[PDB]
Scaffold this active site. Sequence first.
Site, PDB file in Angstrom:
ATOM      1  N   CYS A 122      49.719  14.777 -45.161  1.00  0.00           N
ATOM      2  CA  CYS A 122      50.396  15.534 -44.107  1.00  0.00           C
ATOM      3  C   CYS A 122      49.913  15.030 -42.756  1.00  0.00           C
ATOM      4  O   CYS A 122      48.729  15.137 -42.447  1.00  0.00           O
ATOM      5  CB  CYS A 122      50.085  17.044 -44.260  1.00  0.00           C
ATOM      6  SG  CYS A 122      50.421  18.213 -42.845  1.00  0.00           S
ATOM      7  N   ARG A 170      48.350  18.010 -40.098  1.00  0.00           N
ATOM      8  CA  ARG A 170      46.935  18.401 -40.018  1.00  0.00           C
ATOM      9  C   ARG A 170      46.181  18.382 -38.682  1.00  0.00           C
ATOM     10  O   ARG A 170      45.083  18.920 -38.604  1.00  0.00           O
ATOM     11  CB  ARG A 170      46.112  17.583 -41.021  1.00  0.00           C
ATOM     12  CG  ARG A 170      46.800  17.320 -42.344  1.00  0.00           C
ATOM     13  CD  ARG A 170      45.783  17.120 -43.463  1.00  0.00           C
ATOM     14  NE  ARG A 170      44.705  16.189 -43.116  1.00  0.00           N
ATOM     15  CZ  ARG A 170      44.610  14.941 -43.573  1.00  0.00           C
ATOM     16  NH1 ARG A 170      45.528  14.457 -44.400  1.00  0.00           N
ATOM     17  NH2 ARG A 170      43.584  14.179 -43.219  1.00  0.00           N
ATOM     18  N   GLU A 181      62.267  12.725 -41.956  1.00  0.00           N
ATOM     19  CA  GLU A 181      62.566  13.307 -43.263  1.00  0.00           C
ATOM     20  C   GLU A 181      64.028  13.713 -43.236  1.00  0.00           C
ATOM     21  O   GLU A 181      64.800  13.384 -44.143  1.00  0.00           O
ATOM     22  CB  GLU A 181      61.683  14.531 -43.548  1.00  0.00           C
ATOM     23  CG  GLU A 181      61.744  15.020 -45.007  1.00  0.00           C
ATOM     24  CD  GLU A 181      61.216  13.994 -46.019  1.00  0.00           C
ATOM     25  OE1 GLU A 181      60.508  13.035 -45.596  1.00  0.00           O
ATOM     26  OE2 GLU A 181      61.511  14.157 -47.237  1.00  0.00           O
ATOM     27  N   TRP A 225      56.880  22.639 -38.755  1.00  0.00           N
ATOM     28  CA  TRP A 225      58.152  22.161 -38.256  1.00  0.00           C
ATOM     29  C   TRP A 225      58.383  20.715 -38.644  1.00  0.00           C
ATOM     30  O   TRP A 225      57.441  19.965 -38.883  1.00  0.00           O
ATOM     31  CB  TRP A 225      58.183  22.287 -36.759  1.00  0.00           C
ATOM     32  CG  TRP A 225      57.072  21.586 -36.142  1.00  0.00           C
ATOM     33  CD1 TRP A 225      56.923  20.240 -36.019  1.00  0.00           C
ATOM     34  CD2 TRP A 225      55.973  22.179 -35.463  1.00  0.00           C
ATOM     35  NE1 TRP A 225      55.793  19.954 -35.291  1.00  0.00           N
ATOM     36  CE2 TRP A 225      55.191  21.131 -34.937  1.00  0.00           C
ATOM     37  CE3 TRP A 225      55.572  23.499 -35.243  1.00  0.00           C
ATOM     38  CZ2 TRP A 225      54.027  21.359 -34.201  1.00  0.00           C
ATOM     39  CZ3 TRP A 225      54.413  23.728 -34.507  1.00  0.00           C
ATOM     40  CH2 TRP A 225      53.655  22.660 -33.995  1.00  0.00           C
TER      41      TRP A 225
HETATM   42  C1  HEM Z   1      51.870  20.558 -37.292  1.00  0.00           C
HETATM   43  C2  HEM Z   1      53.068  20.992 -38.158  1.00  0.00           C
HETATM   44  C3  HEM Z   1      53.268  20.112 -39.404  1.00  0.00           C
HETATM   45  C4  HEM Z   1      53.960  18.955 -39.510  1.00  0.00           C
HETATM   46  C5  HEM Z   1      54.736  18.224 -38.407  1.00  0.00           C
HETATM   47  C6  HEM Z   1      53.860  18.526 -40.895  1.00  0.00           C
HETATM   48  C7  HEM Z   1      54.447  17.400 -41.412  1.00  0.00           C
HETATM   49  C8  HEM Z   1      54.404  16.965 -42.712  1.00  0.00           C
HETATM   50  C9  HEM Z   1      55.065  15.803 -43.269  1.00  0.00           C
HETATM   51  C10 HEM Z   1      55.943  14.841 -42.454  1.00  0.00           C
HETATM   52  C11 HEM Z   1      54.786  15.764 -44.588  1.00  0.00           C
HETATM   53  C12 HEM Z   1      55.271  14.751 -45.644  1.00  0.00           C
HETATM   54  C13 HEM Z   1      56.762  15.082 -45.955  1.00  0.00           C
HETATM   55  C14 HEM Z   1      57.293  14.861 -47.373  1.00  0.00           C
HETATM   56  O1  HEM Z   1      57.345  13.726 -47.820  1.00  0.00           O
HETATM   57  O2  HEM Z   1      57.699  15.914 -47.977  1.00  0.00           O
HETATM   58  C15 HEM Z   1      53.906  16.882 -44.877  1.00  0.00           C
HETATM   59  C16 HEM Z   1      53.393  17.210 -46.101  1.00  0.00           C
HETATM   60  C17 HEM Z   1      52.573  18.275 -46.402  1.00  0.00           C
HETATM   61  N1  HEM Z   1      52.173  19.224 -45.486  1.00  0.00           N
HETATM   62 FE1  HEM Z   1      52.611  19.300 -43.572  1.00  0.00          FE
HETATM   63  N2  HEM Z   1      53.077  19.432 -41.608  1.00  0.00           N
HETATM   64  C18 HEM Z   1      52.717  20.411 -40.706  1.00  0.00           C
HETATM   65  C19 HEM Z   1      51.951  21.517 -41.052  1.00  0.00           C
HETATM   66  C20 HEM Z   1      51.427  21.800 -42.299  1.00  0.00           C
HETATM   67  C21 HEM Z   1      50.642  23.008 -42.607  1.00  0.00           C
HETATM   68  C22 HEM Z   1      50.328  24.106 -41.552  1.00  0.00           C
HETATM   69  C23 HEM Z   1      50.298  22.925 -43.915  1.00  0.00           C
HETATM   70  C24 HEM Z   1      49.462  23.881 -44.821  1.00  0.00           C
HETATM   71  C25 HEM Z   1      49.582  25.401 -44.585  1.00  0.00           C
HETATM   72  C26 HEM Z   1      50.895  21.695 -44.417  1.00  0.00           C
HETATM   73  C27 HEM Z   1      50.821  21.232 -45.694  1.00  0.00           C
HETATM   74  C28 HEM Z   1      51.401  20.120 -46.224  1.00  0.00           C
HETATM   75  C29 HEM Z   1      51.320  19.692 -47.607  1.00  0.00           C
HETATM   76  C30 HEM Z   1      50.555  20.433 -48.727  1.00  0.00           C
HETATM   77  C31 HEM Z   1      52.053  18.568 -47.714  1.00  0.00           C
HETATM   78  C32 HEM Z   1      52.301  17.762 -48.979  1.00  0.00           C
HETATM   79  C33 HEM Z   1      53.635  18.279 -49.595  1.00  0.00           C
HETATM   80  C34 HEM Z   1      54.056  17.597 -50.871  1.00  0.00           C
HETATM   81  O3  HEM Z   1      53.148  17.021 -51.505  1.00  0.00           O
HETATM   82  O4  HEM Z   1      55.252  17.658 -51.227  1.00  0.00           O
HETATM   83  N3  HEM Z   1      51.583  21.029 -43.424  1.00  0.00           N
HETATM   84  N4  HEM Z   1      53.718  17.609 -43.733  1.00  0.00           N
HETATM   85  C1  FC1 Z   2      57.750  19.142 -49.354  1.00  0.00           C
HETATM   86  N1  FC1 Z   2      58.863  18.168 -49.466  1.00  0.00           N
HETATM   87  C2  FC1 Z   2      58.910  17.677 -50.852  1.00  0.00           C
HETATM   88  C3  FC1 Z   2      60.184  18.785 -49.161  1.00  0.00           C
HETATM   89  C4  FC1 Z   2      60.294  19.355 -47.731  1.00  0.00           C
HETATM   90  C5  FC1 Z   2      59.865  18.339 -46.681  1.00  0.00           C
HETATM   91  O1  FC1 Z   2      58.586  18.751 -46.181  1.00  0.00           O
HETATM   92  C6  FC1 Z   2      58.286  18.756 -44.816  1.00  0.00           C
HETATM   93  C7  FC1 Z   2      58.963  17.913 -43.984  1.00  0.00           C
HETATM   94  C8  FC1 Z   2      58.754  17.793 -42.511  1.00  0.00           C
HETATM   95  O2  FC1 Z   2      59.410  17.002 -41.820  1.00  0.00           O
HETATM   96  S1  FC1 Z   2      57.514  18.841 -41.801  1.00  0.00           S
HETATM   97  C9  FC1 Z   2      56.750  19.859 -43.032  1.00  0.00           C
HETATM   98  C10 FC1 Z   2      55.720  20.791 -42.735  1.00  0.00           C
HETATM   99  C11 FC1 Z   2      55.144  21.570 -43.765  1.00  0.00           C
HETATM  100  C12 FC1 Z   2      55.598  21.417 -45.105  1.00  0.00           C
HETATM  101  C13 FC1 Z   2      56.628  20.489 -45.410  1.00  0.00           C
HETATM  102  C14 FC1 Z   2      57.209  19.701 -44.374  1.00  0.00           C
HETATM  103  C1  HBI Z   3      58.091   6.364 -55.372  1.00  0.00           C
HETATM  104  C2  HBI Z   3      57.318   6.514 -54.061  1.00  0.00           C
HETATM  105  O1  HBI Z   3      55.916   6.680 -54.336  1.00  0.00           O
HETATM  106  C3  HBI Z   3      57.763   7.755 -53.307  1.00  0.00           C
HETATM  107  O2  HBI Z   3      59.148   7.618 -53.028  1.00  0.00           O
HETATM  108  C4  HBI Z   3      57.058   7.982 -51.988  1.00  0.00           C
HETATM  109  N1  HBI Z   3      57.537   9.214 -51.358  1.00  0.00           N
HETATM  110  C5  HBI Z   3      57.049   9.635 -50.189  1.00  0.00           C
HETATM  111  C6  HBI Z   3      56.004   8.870 -49.463  1.00  0.00           C
HETATM  112  N2  HBI Z   3      55.532   9.337 -48.271  1.00  0.00           N
HETATM  113  C7  HBI Z   3      56.016  10.501 -47.729  1.00  0.00           C
HETATM  114  N3  HBI Z   3      55.543  10.931 -46.569  1.00  0.00           N
HETATM  115  N4  HBI Z   3      56.989  11.231 -48.384  1.00  0.00           N
HETATM  116  C8  HBI Z   3      57.505  10.819 -49.583  1.00  0.00           C
HETATM  117  O3  HBI Z   3      58.376  11.436 -50.211  1.00  0.00           O
HETATM  118  N5  HBI Z   3      55.525   7.709 -50.011  1.00  0.00           N
HETATM  119  C9  HBI Z   3      56.000   7.194 -51.272  1.00  0.00           C
END
Ligand code: HEM
Ligand code: FC1
Ligand code: HBI
Lengths: 414, 414
Positions: free
Chosen positions: A110, A113, A287, A282
């Site tokens: 993320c 963070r 994405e 947000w």
């Molecule tokens: C400053 C606001 C935030 C922004 C701009 C942000 C942005 C993002 C982005 C771009 C991703 C990867 C997107 C994807 O491939 O689904 C991500 C993943 C993640 N974020 Fe955030 N995030 C924010 C806040 C948070 C907060 C407050 C938490 C925890 C309460 C959090 C927890 C996570 C987790 C657990 C993932 C991994 C999700 C997954 O594995 O599918 N994020 N975030």
């Molecule tokens: C979780 N993912 C498989 C699906 C939703 C995309 O997730 C997010 C995309 C952003 O641009 S920002 C953000 C903040 C906090 C949690 C999720 C996101």
């Molecule tokens: C297959 C491959 O590992 C997968 O598509 C990936 N997904 C993602 C990635 N990185 C972010 N942030 N979100 C994804 O969904 N890296 C690799």
Amino acid sequence: QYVRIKNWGSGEILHDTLHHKATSCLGSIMNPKSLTRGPRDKPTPLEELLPHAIEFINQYYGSFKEAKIEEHLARLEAVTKEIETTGTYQLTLDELIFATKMAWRNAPRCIGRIQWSNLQVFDARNCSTAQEMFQHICRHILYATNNGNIRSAITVFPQRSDGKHDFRLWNSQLIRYAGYQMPDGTIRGDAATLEFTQLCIDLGWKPRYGRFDVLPLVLQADGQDPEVFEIPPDLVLEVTMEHPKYEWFQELGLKWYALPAVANMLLEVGGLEFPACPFNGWYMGTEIGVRDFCDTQRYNILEEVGRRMGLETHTLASLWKDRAVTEINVAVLHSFQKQNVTIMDHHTASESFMKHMQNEYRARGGCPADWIWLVPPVSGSITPVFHQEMLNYVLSPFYYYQIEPWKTHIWQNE
Amino acid sequence: QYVRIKNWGSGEILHDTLHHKATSCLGSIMNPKSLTRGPRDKPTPLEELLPHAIEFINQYYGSFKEAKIEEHLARLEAVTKEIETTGTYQLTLDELIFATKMAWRNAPRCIGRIQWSNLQVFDARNCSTAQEMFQHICRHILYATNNGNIRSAITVFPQRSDGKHDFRLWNSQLIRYAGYQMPDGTIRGDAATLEFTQLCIDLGWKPRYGRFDVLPLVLQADGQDPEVFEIPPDLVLEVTMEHPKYEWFQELGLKWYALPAVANMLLEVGGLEFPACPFNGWYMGTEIGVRDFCDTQRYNILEEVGRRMGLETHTLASLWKDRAVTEINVAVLHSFQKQNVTIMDHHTASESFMKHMQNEYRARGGCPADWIWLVPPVSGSITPVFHQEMLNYVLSPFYYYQIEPWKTHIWQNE
Ligand code: HEM
Ligand SMILES: CN(C)CCCOc1cc(=O)sc2ccccc12
Ligand SMILES: C[C@H](O)[C@H](O)C1=Nc2c(nc(N)[nH]c2=O)NC1
Ligand code: HEM
Ligand SMILES: CN(C)CCCOc1cc(=O)sc2ccccc12
Ligand SMILES: C[C@H](O)[C@H](O)C1=Nc2c(nc(N)[nH]c2=O)NC1
């Protein structure tokens, strides 16, 4: 023996043999068991639990710029007792906050963070009804949205007990458009949510067969069957996709929910594990832009934003997709800033995430970073988080993945 | 105890403690010891060598669509003997070919591999003089270049003996512009090659203080000091950077060597290890485009291609860099196709690399892929090799990294 691997986009899968002939990592895999936390059928072995809890409480009283020694020890004994007598235990809400905050501070994939420091904790522990859940959610959604000016928050539902009294919402995320696979070989809205949309259909929810229809939060409160609830329209604030130039854009018929909130994901702290704790933050343009819009396995415009872009849509080498996308990303971002919804272009993000690290190292000398994820899906080498070497690792607390509820669910429906 | 990690671009480095608190990979690191092969001071423990060789020869006779059983066994005994008597051994050139081909077929971070099938092997084993090396190189360079129509080849210098009779060329790659760090805080040509340019200066080579000056191949033949040789201009075929529209481009004063050939990199086969074996292939736009041109730690135009692009060069969120680059990449590619030099836009590459895998799995059920590398530095999510899950792993034969010669070199100069 055969590490299975799948190519998302195509939905193709192959089993890798050859790796055995290795001279002697699976970093590009999406859901490694090394990052989950499935079901249980009985509480948590005191020997296991007790030492963890001690660890946590210890971490906790660590934070303070001024130590609460007495309270520290005190709390420590207090817990052990509590634990030794019942096994389980409850964290003082204040703890749960510091939990969620860190568990985030310790999210490996993320870029967000950098402001883990401030999040909203919704103590829905006392929850007890499916419908009780629902309400609790909307409180969140509504608080989160804030009429465009998004604020990130999390609502902690009740923890785990025997692991048979699980609290779980079967949703990828709070708001997410359906995905009916239309008769004529077509496919509407979002193919991503293809298997799930079927579910909600199988459990009631009527198929408005649209292509931008919000899905029903399907929840389960104690371990009994889950129930369908339609998110109150008034709460789902969307954004329409319009270009600051290519007027022919609006004709695309594109819009997207302004609130990214993950539903299914376990929070683990002090040996305690909470199977339901939706959190939101947000969006980051890309994405929405390149992932749901452009990704071949999702909405998938590009080709059209290409044709009507005039471009050499048929000479791959042209770099037309490279052209198209960039415009699409400017649109999304544009719209947002316009219709006054919060968002953030990747560049500015990466610039900040880096600032986070420099802080994180100078702070606690670490920062579980997963390069494969922390890198903008487009423009990589240009964003600084590419020339940044990073090692990632599961710590605690920590938000984990979980098995698709419908896979492992004793359907009490008898 | 403190895993060091460096952010390339900035040249900053930090030691990671926190990872110890791990619940229990370093995939984003560049040069893991897990991917190298440093010096030696004595031959190779028969017990080690002998079993490897058996393995190889066995792999070899495996290929055949028709088996050479007798020859197989025969060759096997033949080697053991040869080995048992002297320890070391030589591969029948034919083997060395199949070696290099596979060692490539088994490159983890190369999208190229889809045509590993055809490469040019230059048997420079008999080599013996620094100057003897040099010539051997030019033969390569010249063959490789082919007046723009690039052809990929490798020239295998002599193998390892005691590890004190090493054959090594101290160069990142065959052709590569110098990088003088000018008086006025400036920095010319390419900062990447900053420490090395100093070397060539320290060993003779006169500083044409340009910013597009080709570097001297510095070679060492048996383990004695290395010697400087200027690549014969006539051999270094460059390409000038001009845009199919932005006429103001040529004014940038941009060009780039049309031949990517890696110098320093060890080939290992059948327990045998060759410390010098330059190989070349043709460019993929993005390295030239976004990497050497745009990368902050390299040439670094962008800002200018931005200003003179008119763009909002000061409002990061504008996506100007996203704009700029895309044009720069079209230029490079453009020029090339024009000045008739071979090249390949990333997209078409990724499309093919995938085809490779489907082949590789259906073939030998494997394919050591390093996602972090096999993904175009820009436009990731759009190229299919992003939604492809891949596990990578060192096999054999295999091209390894090596320690900077100047670090570990007994300067026979007494
Ligand atoms: C400053 C606001 C935030 C922004 C701009 C942000 C942005 C993002 C982005 C771009 C991703 C990867 C997107 C994807 O491939 O689904 C991500 C993943 C993640 N974020 Fe955030 N995030 C924010 C806040 C948070 C907060 C407050 C938490 C925890 C309460 C959090 C927890 C996570 C987790 C657990 C993932 C991994 C999700 C997954 O594995 O599918 N994020 N975030
Ligand atoms: C979780 N993912 C498989 C699906 C939703 C995309 O997730 C997010 C995309 C952003 O641009 S920002 C953000 C903040 C906090 C949690 C999720 C996101
Ligand atoms: C297959 C491959 O590992 C997968 O598509 C990936 N997904 C993602 C990635 N990185 C972010 N942030 N979100 C994804 O969904 N890296 C690799
Ligand atoms: C089809 C022609 C080829 C193309 C287009 C190609 C392309 C590439 C690219 C884009 C990279 C990564 C660039 C970087 O970051 O430095 C790479 C790396 C690599 N390629 Fe190729 N390649 C080709 C042929 C070959 C051949 C024939 C060999 C072996 C004889 C080879 C061996 C390697 C190795 C070892 C690396 C890793 C280099 C490193 O770690 O610095 N390639 N190639
Ligand atoms: C090795 N690297 C640190 C520097 C040179 C860039 O390497 C290459 C870039 C290309 O686009 S194509 C290619 C083919 C074969 C070997 C190398 C390359
Ligand atoms: C620091 C970071 O690991 C490093 O900059 C990376 N370099 C490269 C990469 N991938 C390729 N193809 N080439 C690189 O130089 N991935 C990551």
